[PDB]
Amino acid sequence: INFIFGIHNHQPLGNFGWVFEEAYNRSYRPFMEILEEFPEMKVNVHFSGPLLEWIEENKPDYLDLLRSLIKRGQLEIVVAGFYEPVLAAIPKEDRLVQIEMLKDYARKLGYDAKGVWLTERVWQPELVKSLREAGIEYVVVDDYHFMSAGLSKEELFWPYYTEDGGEVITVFPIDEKLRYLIPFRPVKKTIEYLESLSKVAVFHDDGEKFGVWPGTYWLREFFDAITEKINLMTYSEYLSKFTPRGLVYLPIASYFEMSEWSLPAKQAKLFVEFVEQLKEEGKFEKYRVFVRGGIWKNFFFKYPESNFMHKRMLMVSKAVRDNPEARKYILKAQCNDAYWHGVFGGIYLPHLRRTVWENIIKAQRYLKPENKILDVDFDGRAEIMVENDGFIATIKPHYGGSIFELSSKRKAVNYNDVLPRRWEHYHEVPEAHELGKQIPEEIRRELAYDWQLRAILQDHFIKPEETLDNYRLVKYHELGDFVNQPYEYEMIENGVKLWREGGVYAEEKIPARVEKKIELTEDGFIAKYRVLLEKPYKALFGVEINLAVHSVMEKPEEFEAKEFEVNDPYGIGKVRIELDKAAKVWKFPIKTLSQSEAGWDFIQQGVSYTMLFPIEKELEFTVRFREL
């Protein structure tokens, strides 16, 4: 029985330096040290570019340990897109570059890589062409992948050929067992033993499992134990002593657990119980092959903010294709984490997303400014992109006519890099990969869910007797229909003039009409508001601006002011809002209940500053945003 052992080491771009060092001391270093003392042990390893760059910077000696092991036949470098992008989600031309960059790093390490670790095992029958042009010969995918096609675990112990266009590529399957056995008391000896007599057993998983995961810090025993009649070799070695099984076509899948996360909240809940139920009735093992959930690509459906971010980098990637310096930036913005969310923080970790927006912005700072209308995120309606030498503002007429994007070319930060508070299927804790935790009351107390998307200049109408804690959480009574409703527009001399004719839906529906004349300025923007109510009524009009304060742990405040500053060192710059008529300001942290390995993640995704003004029949003022 043949055995292929390999690990996948990666750290997302933007991760904290200390997080990096930890992973290093916790597993990257130890693993390779223990590997060095078993000259017969061969590991198939893949280091991501962001990690290799950090290592090259902070721990050079480590790269020498690698050249050493490679030179003594203990390692085969597995490659992929340099910045860990999901190959299927970035332009065809970017893959070639992404792969080639890492392919070149490996060469400088002394190895001629022939294989690619499919990031997040997201597969689409089209990576074949790219991988082939990149000179890659085999891809590592999950056994699951073959199941969803028509095969059975029983016939998944050999590598196959998969094609598209007229080209083929070798696909290796990752046994689900091993990725759950290893690491955990050499039982693999049994599964391996029980493999009898080509035929391989392939194990490939995150290296963080070897020391960084929850108290995972067995190996030394596993190494000589493996080194009997078990023939353990390296991918490359295999694809020279054998030829793939035969041709088989794969479906758009990923590893099993993606099926649940990739589903929208409700379907994720539904799917989990369906899997629990089959298991309970002990029928999941004979039918699993026919049980499937969502597809990675649909996180752009599940998290709108991720979709916008993704479609914005696509526009820029094309506009910067032949611009080497700008291009490097756009390629960094393709680091996968931060675009989705499963078990790890992902899109819920501000610094991971602050890094994507940084690179999207740096890549386009020097391009030529141009205002343009178009359906950016593909929701069937058209945004308005106003841009000057200092900012890029993207307005969504069809949605409150609000500024959904305000990127600072100067700071390479997106002021609206915020997340709406959403309910995740795993927020439902019952019973009271396979660890869990209940929601502590201290959180339950502050756990609210938005019905509004969070942009800049969202217009509300509330009761003059409303409370901040009611608005803060979502227990308040929104009176107007101007937050999530469309506005008409007309391009102005330096911006857009929007307006809508909704109403202040209270005991009686007093038809209303809001007007905002937004125009970019050399230092931000300035919006001139006008709200005339048809019939007199006692109510408060409020303009909401969601800023991406990420490093300043803020708390709910209420105060009178005509002007005020926000200061997020390590976050957004230092901005200042300037009204021309003092108002009641309501400020509050946007807390998100997210999941991770450790446990629950209550994260400040931003901070809402909404200016309340009193109104009965007529109201006028001017909100000014100044970058400092």
Residues at the site binding ligand GLC, with contacts judged by CB under 6 A: 179, 205-206, 255, 257, 342-343, 433
The distance of closest approach from Cβ of residue 84 to ligand GLC in the complex, given in angstroms and rounded to an integer, is 11
Out of Ca ion, ligand GLC, none, which partner does residue 94 contact, by CB within 5 to 8 A per kind?
A: none
- The residues facing 181 across adjacent strands are none
Q: Quick check: is 84 catalytic?
A: no
Instruction: Tell me how far the alpha carbon of residue 374 is from its chain's centroid.
Output: 24
Question: Do residues 519 and 492 make contact, with C-beta atoms less than 8 angstroms apart?
Answer: yes
Q: Which amino acid is present at 561?
A: A
Question: Residue count at the site for Ca ion (CB under 5 A)?
Answer: 5
Euclidean distance between CA atoms 320 and 327, whole angstroms: 5
Give burial (CB, 10 Å; 0-12/13-18/19+) of 286: exposed
* Sign of the dihedral defined by the CA atoms of residues 251, 10, 85, 137, in that order: negative
Active-site residue, selected from the candidate residues 22, 36, 164, 206: 206
Residue 523 within binding range of Ca ion, rule CB under 5 A: no
Residue 206 contact among Ca ion, ligand GLC, none, beta carbon within 5 to 8 Å by kind: ligand GLC
Of 361 and 385, nearer to Ca ion (C-beta) is 385
Stretch that binds Ca ion, among 189-197, 219-227, 381-389, 533-541 (CB under 5 A): 381-389
Active site (annotated) includes residue 206 = yes
By C-beta, is 213 or 223 nearer to ligand GLC? 213
Contact 124, 97 (CB under 8 A): no
CB nearer to Ca ion: give 377 or 544.
Answer: 377
Among residues 22, 133, 379, 523, the one that binds Ca ion under rule CB under 5 A? 379
Judged on CB neighbours under 10 Å (0-12, 13-18, 19+), 322 is exposed
What's the min distance (Å) between Cβ of 483 and Ca ion? 17
Distance CA 483, CA 461 (A): 9
Q: How far is the CB of 261 from ligand GLC (least distance, A)?
A: 8
Residue 273 interacts, among Ca ion, ligand GLC, none and using kind-specific CB cut-offs from 5 to 8 Å, with none
Phi, psi of 374 (to 5 degrees): 170, 155
Give the torsion sign (CA, 126, 129, 134, 136): positive
Residue 439 CA to residue 446 CA, distance in Å, equals: 11
Min separation Cβ 302 and Ca ion, Å: 17
Cβ closest to ligand GLC, residue 204 vs residue 516: 204
CB of 451 to ligand GLC, least distance (A): 30
- Our finding on whether 237 is near Ca ion (CB under 5 A) is no
CB-nearer residue toward ligand GLC: 85 or 342: 342
CB of 407 to Ca ion, least distance (A): 17
Beta-strand pair 200-206/509-511: unpaired
Rg value, the chain, Cα: 27
Least distance to ligand GLC, CB of residue 204, Å: 8
**From Ca ion, ligand GLC, none, which one binds at residue 133 (CB under 5 to 8 Å depending on kind)?**
none
CA pair distance 524, 393, nearest whole angstrom? 9
Packing angle of the helix pair 92-109, 60-71 (nearest 10 deg): 80
Question: Which of 375, 389, 469, 522 is the binder for Ca ion (CB under 5 A)?
Answer: 375
Nearer to ligand GLC, 119 or 414 (CB): 119
Interaction partner, residue 379 (ligand GLC, Ca ion, none; CB < 5-8 Å by kind):
Ca ion
Paired with 227 in beta bridges are none
Which listed residue (76, 84, 94, 120) is catalytic?
120
Which residues in the chain precede a discontinuity of more than 2.5 Å between C and N? Answer: 197, 217, 227, 432
Structure tokens at 64: 């020498």
Catalytic residues: 120, 206
Residue numbers at the binding site for Ca ion (CB under 5 A): 375, 377, 379, 381, 383
